mmCIF file of C-alpha atoms in Angstrom:
data_model
loop_
_atom_site.group_PDB
_atom_site.id
_atom_site.type_symbol
_atom_site.label_atom_id
_atom_site.label_comp_id
_atom_site.label_asym_id
_atom_site.label_seq_id
_atom_site.Cartn_x
_atom_site.Cartn_y
_atom_site.Cartn_z
ATOM 1 C CA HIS D 1 -13.320 40.978 7.744
ATOM 2 C CA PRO D 2 -15.557 42.212 10.623
ATOM 3 C CA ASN D 3 -16.396 45.633 9.101
ATOM 4 C CA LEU D 4 -17.306 44.242 5.641
ATOM 5 C CA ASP D 5 -18.953 41.035 6.887
ATOM 6 C CA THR D 6 -21.143 42.937 9.353
ATOM 7 C CA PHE D 7 -24.393 44.455 8.052
ATOM 8 C CA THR D 8 -25.359 48.056 8.760
ATOM 9 C CA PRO D 9 -28.785 48.774 10.267
ATOM 10 C CA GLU D 10 -30.014 49.797 6.802
ATOM 11 C CA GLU D 11 -28.817 46.514 5.239
ATOM 12 C CA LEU D 12 -30.477 44.549 8.082
ATOM 13 C CA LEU D 13 -33.759 46.327 7.389
ATOM 14 C CA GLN D 14 -33.388 45.557 3.693
ATOM 15 C CA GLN D 15 -32.819 41.876 4.493
ATOM 16 C CA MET D 16 -35.921 41.865 6.736
ATOM 17 C CA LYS D 17 -37.997 43.330 3.916
ATOM 18 C CA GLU D 18 -36.711 40.604 1.576
ATOM 19 C CA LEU D 19 -37.396 37.707 4.006
ATOM 20 C CA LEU D 20 -40.912 39.019 4.536
ATOM 21 C CA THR D 21 -41.484 38.954 0.772
ATOM 22 C CA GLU D 22 -40.079 35.447 0.472
ATOM 23 C CA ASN D 23 -42.193 34.194 3.367
ATOM 24 C CA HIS D 24 -45.357 35.817 2.002
ATOM 25 C CA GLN D 25 -44.808 34.275 -1.420
ATOM 26 C CA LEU D 26 -44.191 30.953 0.322
ATOM 27 C CA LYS D 27 -47.433 31.236 2.313
ATOM 28 C CA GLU D 28 -49.505 32.168 -0.746
ATOM 29 C CA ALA D 29 -47.975 29.307 -2.788
ATOM 30 C CA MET D 30 -48.867 26.826 -0.046
ATOM 31 C CA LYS D 31 -52.462 28.110 -0.005
ATOM 32 C CA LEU D 32 -52.634 27.395 -3.735
ATOM 33 C CA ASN D 33 -51.113 23.938 -3.238
ATOM 34 C CA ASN D 34 -53.757 23.078 -0.609
ATOM 35 C CA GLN D 35 -56.586 24.189 -2.899
ATOM 36 C CA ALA D 36 -55.148 22.074 -5.728
ATOM 37 C CA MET D 37 -54.575 19.054 -3.468
ATOM 38 C CA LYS D 38 -58.232 19.214 -2.440
ATOM 39 C CA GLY D 39 -59.100 19.189 -6.145
ATOM 40 C CA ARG D 40 -56.815 16.214 -6.847
ATOM 41 C CA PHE D 41 -58.497 14.425 -3.940
ATOM 42 C CA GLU D 42 -62.053 14.916 -5.269
ATOM 43 C CA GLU D 43 -60.882 13.871 -8.736
ATOM 44 C CA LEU D 44 -59.268 10.689 -7.472
ATOM 45 C CA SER D 45 -62.387 9.875 -5.376
ATOM 46 C CA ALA D 46 -64.723 10.375 -8.313
ATOM 47 C CA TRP D 47 -62.372 8.302 -10.509
ATOM 48 C CA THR D 48 -62.154 5.335 -8.163
ATOM 49 C CA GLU D 49 -65.967 5.280 -7.944
ATOM 50 C CA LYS D 50 -66.215 5.258 -11.727
ATOM 51 C CA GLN D 51 -63.685 2.420 -11.919
ATOM 52 C CA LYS D 52 -65.592 0.300 -9.389
ATOM 53 C CA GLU D 53 -68.839 0.845 -11.289
ATOM 54 C CA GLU D 54 -67.238 -0.150 -14.595
ATOM 55 C CA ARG D 55 -65.627 -3.224 -13.016
ATOM 56 C CA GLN D 56 -69.057 -4.259 -11.740
ATOM 57 C CA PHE D 57 -70.707 -3.781 -15.131
ATOM 58 C CA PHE D 58 -68.135 -6.171 -16.556
ATOM 59 C CA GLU D 59 -68.392 -8.766 -13.750
ATOM 60 C CA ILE D 60 -72.129 -8.786 -14.310
ATOM 61 C CA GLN D 61 -71.853 -9.091 -18.114
ATOM 62 C CA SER D 62 -69.373 -11.922 -17.690
ATOM 63 C CA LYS D 63 -71.592 -13.811 -15.233
ATOM 64 C CA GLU D 64 -74.687 -13.380 -17.398
ATOM 65 C CA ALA D 65 -72.788 -14.610 -20.470
ATOM 66 C CA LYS D 66 -71.400 -17.627 -18.619
ATOM 67 C CA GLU D 67 -74.956 -18.459 -17.504
ATOM 68 C CA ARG D 68 -76.697 -17.972 -20.896
ATOM 69 C CA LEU D 69 -74.214 -20.465 -22.263
ATOM 70 C CA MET D 70 -74.952 -23.158 -19.680
ATOM 71 C CA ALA D 71 -78.697 -22.540 -20.026
ATOM 72 C CA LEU D 72 -78.465 -23.801 -23.624
ATOM 73 C CA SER D 73 -75.668 -26.393 -23.590
ATOM 74 C CA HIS D 74 -78.378 -28.446 -21.904
ATOM 75 C CA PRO I 1 -26.454 49.288 16.818
ATOM 76 C CA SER I 2 -23.509 48.174 18.985
ATOM 77 C CA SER I 3 -20.875 46.020 17.270
ATOM 78 C CA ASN I 4 -21.922 42.847 19.099
ATOM 79 C CA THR I 5 -25.605 43.421 18.325
ATOM 80 C CA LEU I 6 -24.940 44.002 14.608
ATOM 81 C CA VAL I 7 -22.639 40.966 14.403
ATOM 82 C CA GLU I 8 -25.184 38.708 16.072
ATOM 83 C CA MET I 9 -28.066 40.116 13.990
ATOM 84 C CA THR I 10 -25.987 39.673 10.835
ATOM 85 C CA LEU I 11 -25.210 36.034 11.629
ATOM 86 C CA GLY I 12 -28.873 35.422 12.386
ATOM 87 C CA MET I 13 -30.112 37.183 9.268
ATOM 88 C CA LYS I 14 -27.706 35.287 7.027
ATOM 89 C CA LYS I 15 -28.857 32.034 8.639
ATOM 90 C CA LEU I 16 -32.527 32.881 8.000
ATOM 91 C CA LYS I 17 -31.720 33.549 4.339
ATOM 92 C CA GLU I 18 -29.907 30.216 4.084
ATOM 93 C CA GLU I 19 -32.770 28.261 5.610
ATOM 94 C CA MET I 20 -35.298 29.907 3.331
ATOM 95 C CA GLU I 21 -33.206 28.911 0.306
ATOM 96 C CA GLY I 22 -33.692 25.346 1.535
ATOM 97 C CA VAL I 23 -37.400 25.835 2.229
ATOM 98 C CA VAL I 24 -38.158 27.210 -1.239
ATOM 99 C CA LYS I 25 -36.405 24.221 -2.833
ATOM 100 C CA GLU I 26 -38.641 22.009 -0.654
ATOM 101 C CA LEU I 27 -41.633 23.930 -1.964
ATOM 102 C CA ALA I 28 -40.370 23.530 -5.550
ATOM 103 C CA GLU I 29 -40.309 19.774 -5.001
ATOM 104 C CA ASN I 30 -43.843 19.904 -3.508
ATOM 105 C CA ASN I 31 -45.002 21.758 -6.657
ATOM 106 C CA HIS I 32 -43.445 19.104 -8.897
ATOM 107 C CA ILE I 33 -45.092 16.205 -7.053
ATOM 108 C CA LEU I 34 -48.462 17.997 -7.064
ATOM 109 C CA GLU I 35 -48.183 18.465 -10.826
ATOM 110 C CA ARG I 36 -47.675 14.695 -11.163
ATOM 111 C CA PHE I 37 -50.793 14.036 -9.031
ATOM 112 C CA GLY I 38 -52.887 15.396 -11.886
ATOM 113 C CA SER I 39 -51.648 12.604 -14.183
ATOM 114 C CA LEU I 40 -52.558 9.526 -12.099
ATOM 115 C CA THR I 41 -55.992 9.000 -13.677
ATOM 116 C CA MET I 42 -54.842 9.512 -17.267
ATOM 117 C CA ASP I 43 -53.957 7.184 -20.222
ATOM 118 C CA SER W 1 -31.768 53.543 18.861
ATOM 119 C CA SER W 2 -34.232 56.103 17.454
ATOM 120 C CA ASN W 3 -36.388 54.829 14.592
ATOM 121 C CA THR W 4 -33.988 52.092 13.478
ATOM 122 C CA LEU W 5 -34.883 49.985 16.513
ATOM 123 C CA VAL W 6 -38.441 51.135 15.767
ATOM 124 C CA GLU W 7 -38.091 50.029 12.147
ATOM 125 C CA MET W 8 -36.318 46.769 13.040
ATOM 126 C CA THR W 9 -39.043 45.919 15.601
ATOM 127 C CA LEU W 10 -41.822 46.220 13.003
ATOM 128 C CA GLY W 11 -39.789 44.249 10.470
ATOM 129 C CA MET W 12 -39.144 41.424 12.924
ATOM 130 C CA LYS W 13 -42.796 41.387 14.007
ATOM 131 C CA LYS W 14 -44.150 41.130 10.459
ATOM 132 C CA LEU W 15 -41.669 38.351 9.646
ATOM 133 C CA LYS W 16 -42.849 36.407 12.679
ATOM 134 C CA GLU W 17 -46.530 36.785 11.726
ATOM 135 C CA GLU W 18 -45.746 35.692 8.146
ATOM 136 C CA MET W 19 -43.829 32.582 9.223
ATOM 137 C CA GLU W 20 -46.766 31.748 11.491
ATOM 138 C CA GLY W 21 -49.003 31.927 8.427
ATOM 139 C CA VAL W 22 -46.742 29.476 6.578
ATOM 140 C CA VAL W 23 -46.992 26.991 9.468
ATOM 141 C CA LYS W 24 -50.795 27.047 9.268
ATOM 142 C CA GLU W 25 -50.742 26.267 5.539
ATOM 143 C CA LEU W 26 -48.254 23.481 6.102
ATOM 144 C CA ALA W 27 -50.554 22.126 8.830
ATOM 145 C CA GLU W 28 -53.463 22.050 6.385
ATOM 146 C CA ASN W 29 -51.264 20.373 3.761
ATOM 147 C CA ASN W 30 -50.314 17.628 6.222
ATOM 148 C CA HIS W 31 -54.012 17.094 6.996
ATOM 149 C CA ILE W 32 -54.849 16.670 3.323
ATOM 150 C CA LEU W 33 -51.968 14.167 3.001
ATOM 151 C CA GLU W 34 -53.400 12.095 5.861
ATOM 152 C CA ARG W 35 -56.693 11.846 4.001
ATOM 153 C CA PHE W 36 -54.823 10.755 0.880
ATOM 154 C CA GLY W 37 -53.525 7.754 2.844
ATOM 155 C CA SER W 38 -57.137 7.041 3.754
ATOM 156 C CA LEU W 39 -58.136 6.971 0.075
ATOM 157 C CA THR W 40 -56.101 3.865 -0.802
ATOM 158 C CA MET W 41 -57.344 1.925 2.228
ATOM 159 C CA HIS Q 1 -36.365 54.107 29.845
ATOM 160 C CA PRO Q 2 -37.034 52.396 26.472
ATOM 161 C CA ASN Q 3 -40.542 52.739 24.978
ATOM 162 C CA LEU Q 4 -42.916 49.770 25.322
ATOM 163 C CA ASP Q 5 -43.612 48.971 21.678
ATOM 164 C CA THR Q 6 -39.969 49.260 20.624
ATOM 165 C CA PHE Q 7 -37.393 46.486 21.110
ATOM 166 C CA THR Q 8 -34.281 47.089 23.178
ATOM 167 C CA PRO Q 9 -31.103 45.638 21.649
ATOM 168 C CA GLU Q 10 -31.411 42.628 23.994
ATOM 169 C CA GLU Q 11 -35.062 42.103 23.002
ATOM 170 C CA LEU Q 12 -34.142 42.391 19.323
ATOM 171 C CA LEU Q 13 -31.574 39.605 19.660
ATOM 172 C CA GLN Q 14 -34.070 37.465 21.610
ATOM 173 C CA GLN Q 15 -36.593 37.914 18.827
ATOM 174 C CA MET Q 16 -33.920 36.972 16.287
ATOM 175 C CA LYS Q 17 -33.176 33.714 18.133
ATOM 176 C CA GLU Q 18 -36.906 32.911 18.123
ATOM 177 C CA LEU Q 19 -37.081 33.405 14.363
ATOM 178 C CA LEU Q 20 -34.136 31.062 13.862
ATOM 179 C CA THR Q 21 -35.843 28.443 15.996
ATOM 180 C CA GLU Q 22 -39.157 28.801 14.161
ATOM 181 C CA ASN Q 23 -37.530 28.847 10.703
ATOM 182 C CA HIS Q 24 -35.476 25.754 11.486
ATOM 183 C CA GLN Q 25 -38.671 24.069 12.701
ATOM 184 C CA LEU Q 26 -40.409 25.035 9.447
ATOM 185 C CA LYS Q 27 -37.573 23.640 7.364
ATOM 186 C CA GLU Q 28 -37.600 20.259 9.085
ATOM 187 C CA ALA Q 29 -41.406 20.095 8.879
ATOM 188 C CA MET Q 30 -41.216 20.854 5.162
ATOM 189 C CA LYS Q 31 -38.751 17.988 4.623
ATOM 190 C CA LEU Q 32 -41.146 15.703 6.483
ATOM 191 C CA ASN Q 33 -44.042 17.057 4.449
ATOM 192 C CA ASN Q 34 -42.276 16.394 1.184
ATOM 193 C CA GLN Q 35 -41.423 12.853 2.267
ATOM 194 C CA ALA Q 36 -45.151 12.428 2.926
ATOM 195 C CA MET Q 37 -46.049 13.886 -0.497
ATOM 196 C CA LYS Q 38 -43.751 11.378 -2.160
ATOM 197 C CA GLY Q 39 -45.052 8.475 -0.064
ATOM 198 C CA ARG Q 40 -48.651 9.317 -0.905
ATOM 199 C CA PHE Q 41 -47.809 9.776 -4.605
ATOM 200 C CA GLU Q 42 -46.223 6.317 -4.596
ATOM 201 C CA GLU Q 43 -49.243 4.765 -2.832
ATOM 202 C CA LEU Q 44 -51.752 6.432 -5.129
ATOM 203 C CA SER Q 45 -49.817 5.344 -8.224
ATOM 204 C CA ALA Q 46 -49.834 1.727 -7.087
ATOM 205 C CA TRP Q 47 -53.523 2.005 -6.159
ATOM 206 C CA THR Q 48 -54.706 3.576 -9.416
ATOM 207 C CA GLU Q 49 -52.692 0.983 -11.342
ATOM 208 C CA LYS Q 50 -54.281 -1.871 -9.421
ATOM 209 C CA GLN Q 51 -57.775 -0.622 -10.287
ATOM 210 C CA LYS Q 52 -56.966 -0.273 -14.003
ATOM 211 C CA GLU Q 53 -55.596 -3.829 -14.051
ATOM 212 C CA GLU Q 54 -58.718 -5.105 -12.287
ATOM 213 C CA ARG Q 55 -61.057 -3.252 -14.662
ATOM 214 C CA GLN Q 56 -59.134 -4.608 -17.635
ATOM 215 C CA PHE Q 57 -59.228 -8.149 -16.270
ATOM 216 C CA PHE Q 58 -63.029 -8.141 -16.092
ATOM 217 C CA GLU Q 59 -63.386 -6.360 -19.409
ATOM 218 C CA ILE Q 60 -61.346 -9.112 -21.080
ATOM 219 C CA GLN Q 61 -63.256 -11.793 -19.166
ATOM 220 C CA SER Q 62 -66.582 -10.332 -20.322
ATOM 221 C CA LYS Q 63 -65.426 -9.919 -23.923
ATOM 222 C CA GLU Q 64 -64.205 -13.505 -24.210
ATOM 223 C CA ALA Q 65 -67.344 -14.896 -22.545
ATOM 224 C CA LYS Q 66 -69.566 -13.085 -25.045
ATOM 225 C CA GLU Q 67 -67.381 -14.310 -27.922
ATOM 226 C CA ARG Q 68 -67.716 -17.843 -26.612
ATOM 227 C CA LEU Q 69 -71.485 -17.415 -26.336
ATOM 228 C CA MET Q 70 -71.732 -16.333 -29.974
ATOM 229 C CA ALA Q 71 -69.482 -19.018 -31.418
ATOM 230 C CA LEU Q 72 -71.158 -21.802 -29.453
ATOM 231 C CA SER Q 73 -74.714 -20.491 -30.047
ATOM 232 C CA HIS Q 74 -74.812 -22.017 -33.555
#
C-alpha cells in the first residue's frame, strides 16, 4: 500500500518533532545518570575508606588482646 | 516531495523511530542498574 | 519545495545536534564506568 | 538555483542516511555501555561483599580475643 504506507510532508515533519523530543529527553536523562553515577562513586569511595579503617581498628584490638594475654601467662 | 523522496524519507523515519525504541529500553535498563548501585553499601 | 524543505531542513538539523548531545553524555558515562573498574583494583 | 541554507531533495536524503548511521552507532554504543554497567555492578558487588566479610572476620577475632583475655585473667 504505497499511498497509505508513505508519509506526507506534514507527517514527516511531525515525526521529526517527535524524534527531537525523544532525543532531548534521552540526553537530559543521561545527564542525570552521570551526575548520580558520580555521587555513587564518591559514596563507594568514602565507604571503602571507612571499612578499611574499621578493619584496622579490629586488627589492632585483636593484636593488643593477644599480647596482653601472653604478657601475663608468664 | 517526489514519490521516491517521500518513500525513502518514510523508510528512514520509521527506522529512526524503531532504533530509538531500542535505545530508550537500553536507557531504562541503565536506570535500573543505577538504582541498584545505591544499595551496595547497605545492610 | 517552498517552506516544507525549509521546515524539514531545520527539523533534520536540530535532530542531528540533539543526537550529538546524547553521544557526549554517553561518552561521559563510559568514562565514569572506567573509573568504577579502577575502584575495585 | 536552490537557496544555500535549505536542503535540496538529494541533500535531504543524504542527511537522512547520516542520521540512520549515527542513530545505529548510538544504539550499539548503548548496548556496550549497558554491558559495562552490568559488569561494573557485578564487580562492585563482589568487592563490597569481600570488604564486609573481612571486617566481620576481624571483628569476630577481636571479640573472641577479648573474651579469652577476660576469662583467663582470673
